[PDB]
Structure formats: C-alpha cells, structure tokens
Design a protein around this ligand. Structure first.
Ligand SMILES: Nc1ncnc2c1ncn2[C@@H]1O[C@H](COP(=O)(O)OP(=O)(O)O)[C@@H](O)[C@H]1O
Ligand SMILES: [Mg+2]
Length: 204
C-alpha cells in the first residue's frame, strides 16, 4: 500500500485536476486506487458524485481520517490524498503518512511561496523518515517558467520531468464528471500517462 499526497495550501495550484487524472491513469494500469478528498469545498467529492470515477473516492471529515489512512485504506495499491487549503493540520498529517508527496505549482511567481510551506514540513519529516517529494508544474504554457525552475532548485526538491500543460479538456472533463481519458485528446492523455509512469518509476 502506498500513499501519494498532492499538497499545496494555495488554491488553484492544480491539485484536484492532477489527482483526478493521475488517479485514473493508475487505475487504467490495473492498480486499485483510493482517493481521499481533504478539501472542505469537496471539489473531488462532488465531481465523483457523477458516478464515473474509475476508482474509490473518500471524503475526510478531519485530520483524524488522514491519520488513519494506512490502516483504513490498506487493501488498495495506492491511496491518493487530494490536499486542502487553510487547514495546515491536513498537510502535516498527509506528509506524516505519505510515501510520495507531490507539490503542484503553477508558473505564477507570487504563488510559489505557498509551495514552500510544504517543503518546510518535509524537511521536518526527514528527521523521522525522509519521504520522496516532487514538484509538479501545472497550467504550463515563458520566462517566469524558467524563474520557477530555479526557485524549485533552491528548495532542494526536484520537479517531475513532465509538466501538466494548460488545456481546456482538463476543465471540461472535470465539469462533465470524468477525466481526460474519457476524451479523444491524445496529447492530454499522453502527458498524464507519461507523468503517471514517472510516478510509478519512482516507486519501482
Ligand atoms: N492543467 C490545467 N489546464 C487548464 N486549466 C487548469 C489546469 N489545472 C487547473 N486548471 C484550472 O484551474 C483551476 C484550479 O484547478 P484545481 O485542480 O481545482 O486546483 P486545486 O486542486 O488547486 O484547487 C481549475 O478549476 C481550472 O479552471
Ligand atoms: Mg482542489
């Protein structure tokens, strides 16, 4: 059983969109996936209500639910935590039980600051058990793209090779209650797929 958490208190980092699609790609690979929504706005929970999720969706009522994910979702291959906002406990709880922390970040310069709060938590965790961490560029298109790439290197945490390109298909699919794999967008499905293999490769 492995836990993957998408953390970044900043809203609009692209956590839910990534989670929904990467979780779906993992299912397509034959893995049993459990996703836990920790956001109060329940973006993912509501999306799943459409009934098209290719995995199991859970809605956390508090940090307590995150705290007991290892035991609760122990029968799944992967348990993905869809990060919250202001509730900083969620981040600490997630990091504490995660095997892979992914930090979705956009090229927005004035938004990288929030992603750093997660790194601070990671560094602290390192004392107990260093958890693999990766930055993930989302809503990719630039110069600020390069500046972001340098700020990331300063954190000591590497970024995934594949970035989530900004595409309407990501917005529409979630809106229709499904993922990019329910569309005919090969490029979109492709990067999500390649990205999903970089995740799997990290575990292998
Ligand atoms: N890869 C993407 N391509 C196009 N728009 C995106 C992408 N990722 C996120 N967005 C847009 O930005 C918003 C924030 O994404 P979301 O996954 O909800 O973020 P968090 O998970 O940051 O709340 C979406 O509602 C959508 O409008
Ligand atoms: Mg979200």
């Amino acid at each position: 059983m492995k836990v993957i958490s998408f953390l970044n208190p900043k809203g609009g980092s692209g956590k839910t969109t990534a989670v929904i699609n990467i979780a779906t790609a993992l299912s397509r690979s034959g893995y049993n996936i459990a996703v836990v929504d920790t956001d109060p706005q329940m973006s993912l929970t509501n999306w799943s209500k459409a009934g098209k999720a290719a995995f199991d969706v859970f809605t956390a009522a508090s940090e307590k639910d995150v705290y007991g994910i290892r035991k609760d979702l122990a029968d799944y291959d992967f348990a993905i935590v869809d990060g919250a906002g202001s509730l900083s406990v969620i981040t600490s709880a997630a990091v504490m039980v995660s095997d892979l922390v992914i930090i979705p970040v956009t090229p927005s310069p004035l938004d990288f600051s929030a992603a750093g709060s997660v790194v601070t938590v990671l560094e602290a965790q390192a004392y107990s058990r260093k958890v693999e961490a990766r930055f993930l560029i989302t809503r990719k298109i630039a110069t600020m793209l390069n500046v972001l790439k340098e700020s990331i290197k300063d954190t000591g945490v590497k970024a995934f090779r594949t970035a989530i390109t900004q595409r309407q298909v990501y917005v529409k699919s979630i809106l229709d209650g499904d993922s990019v794999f329910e569309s005919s967008d090969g490029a979109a499905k492709g990067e999500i797929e390649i990205l999903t293999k970089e995740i799997v490769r990290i575990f292998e």
